[PDB]
């Protein structure tokens, strides 16, 4: 499914991996949530390990480089669309 | 040289590459690939985190060590 997640501005308690410049997720250019701290802000916002981040405040990151995705997430609540499951 | 770098948690974003399970840096090491545009520099090899050795860690082992609920990093550069 595809879910809308509201994520505070960045700490968030998450790591992301991946990108079009190339882990156990997918299998594959996507950017994925690779770990969330259990009571961190990312977890409480409803993000999940394995989530594929599709967009960030309208920026399409489905084919983005790893650093493109991150920059998007760190621009100074974020609206994320993720694919999961 | 090898430096101990203290970073207050609230400094924003850290990117890393490498690991033992495996860029232009270095090695089997874990290396800082980006820092949000203080103290740490791109290309720094991360040797320890909060006194815990990561010199030989896997990439995911490094990540889990960086992802901590102040953060202390021991790094080698050059």
């Amino acid at each position: 499914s595809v879910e809308e997640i509201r994520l505070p501005r960045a700490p968030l308690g998450l790591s992301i991996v991946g990108g079009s410049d190339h882990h156990p997720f997918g299998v594959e250019p996507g950017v994925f949530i690779s770990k969330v701290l259990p009571r961190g802000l990312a977890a409480r916002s409803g993000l999940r390990v394995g989530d594929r981040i599709l967009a960030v405040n309208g920026q399409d990151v489905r084919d983005a480089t790893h650093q493109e995705a991150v920059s998007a997430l760190l621009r100074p609540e974020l609206s994320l669309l993720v694919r999961r499951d | 040289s090898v430096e101990e770098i203290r970073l207050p948690r609230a400094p924003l974003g850290l990117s890393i590459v490498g690991g033992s399970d495996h860029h232009p840096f270095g090695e089997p090491g874990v290396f800082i690939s980006k820092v949000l545009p203080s103290g740490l520099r791109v290309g720094d090899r991360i040797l320890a985190v909060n006194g815990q050795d990561v010199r030989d860690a896997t990439h995911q082992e490094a990540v889990s060590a960086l992802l901590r609920p102040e953060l202390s990093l021991l790094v080698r550069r050059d």
Partner: peptide
């Protein structure tokens, strides 16, 4: 293989 911690 690149990760980011935020």
């Amino acid at each position: 293989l690149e990760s980011s911690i935020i």
